């Protein structure tokens, strides 16, 4: 027979189980390093509504070792989740969040309609309605200066043909599945060519 012979736990639990999450317009970036990562349990549970890896297999992820794992967590509507993909143009890609085409990442989305959606609506979540230029990949902008769609300058005040760059998200239970919010986590892997802080 063959004889193959947990401990440190990468903190995916904070990333996948939080009551409130950073808004898409400004998102916290978390680096996961120096821990043992098991992705088999996450896939087997299938608690998330969809488990998606564009260039990788979920069973392969636990066996594979990535020295640095980067988790980007934000709450966006289901239609926005379809827009967010590497190598795919999206309204989110144009403004608040940009994905590098060369980069390959796992995007995992689970419905947050039960908790995030409110009858009043949740204004804690926010998105960027418009931006003067496309944001750099893996970067966020906090500028509140009015977007100058009109030739005449906005001058930092609301005006005809002037639209505020950031618009507060509105999430309700009676909204459609695409309108309803989905929590999304994006994973970036350093993989080879780096000291192996994380071992599968």
């Amino acid at each position, epitope marked *: 027979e063959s004889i193959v012979r947990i401990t440190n736990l990468c903190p995916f639990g904070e990333v996948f189980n939080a009551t409130r999450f950073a808004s898409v317009y400004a998102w916290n970036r978390k680096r996961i390093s120096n821990c043992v990562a098991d992705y088999s349990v996450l896939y087997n549970s299938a608690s998330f509504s969809t488990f998606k890896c564009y260039g990788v297999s979920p069973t392969k992820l636990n066996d594979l070792c990535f020295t640095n794992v980067y988790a980007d967590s934000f709450v966006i509507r289901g239609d926005e989740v379809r827009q967010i993909a590497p190598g795919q143009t999206g309204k989110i890609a144009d403004y608040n969040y940009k994905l590098p085409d060369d980069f390959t990442g796992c995007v995992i989305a689970w*419905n947050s*309609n*039960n908790l995030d*959606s409110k*009858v*009043g*609506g949740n*204004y804690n979540y926010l998105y960027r309605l418009f931006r003067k230029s496309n944001l750099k990949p893996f970067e966020r902008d906090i500028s509140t200066e009015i977007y100058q769609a009109g030739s005449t300058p906005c001058n930092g005040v609301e005006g005809f043909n002037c639209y505020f760059p950031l618009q*507060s998200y*509105g999430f*309700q*239970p*009676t*909204n*459609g*599945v*695409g*309108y*309803q919010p989905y929590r999304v986590v994006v994973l970036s892997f350093e993989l080879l060519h780096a000291p192996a802080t994380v071992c599968g």
Partner: antibody
Amino acid sequence: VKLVESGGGLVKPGGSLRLSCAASGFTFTNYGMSWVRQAPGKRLEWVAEISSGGSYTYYPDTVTGRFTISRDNAKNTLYLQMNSLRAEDTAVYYCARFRYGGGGTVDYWGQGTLVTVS
Amino acid sequence: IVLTQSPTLSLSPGERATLSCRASESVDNYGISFMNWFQQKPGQAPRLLIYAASNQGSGIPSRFSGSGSGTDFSLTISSLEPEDFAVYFCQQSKEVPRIFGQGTKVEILK
């Protein structure tokens, strides 16, 4: 588009009357559904509810409806099982289809439901 | 919350029908667009008119137009028709089970 409902039937007060709402023409998942009574001489009183993602089953605190909404997305069918039936339950219930996120909104409804408890 | 409407109108064709939806407690929306308008044909299923009073479109004829102000919502029908009037409703939202308008009907003389 339209809704097919569970029509007129009579029970004594105190029971539980199942309703049913069939969906004709739309995707029953993507729409919050509901049941809303119009009784004569009564304004529409928003009663029964369901969300499009999970189960919300929201009812007005007022006097508890005790309604048992479910969804079958294979049937596209909403139910209203109204526990603790009473004579006042006699009314026109409307299983209604919510539109996409907005001011309300309820563009499409059932044809009206005869429900009588007396 | 709870709302009120202008009770009724009695009018003639080719006229404006102004209907208040008067909400107790909260006024409309923090996103500044809420309440609603609804019509129920007599002895018939209710039907949408306007959501957030500013809005909609096809299925709601152009004679339905208007806005709302704080609590009050204006259901405004210019060019009335004796065929087209039926009990009109609005909804609250964002607070309470969203309830509805107490209902309003515009009579037409002539």
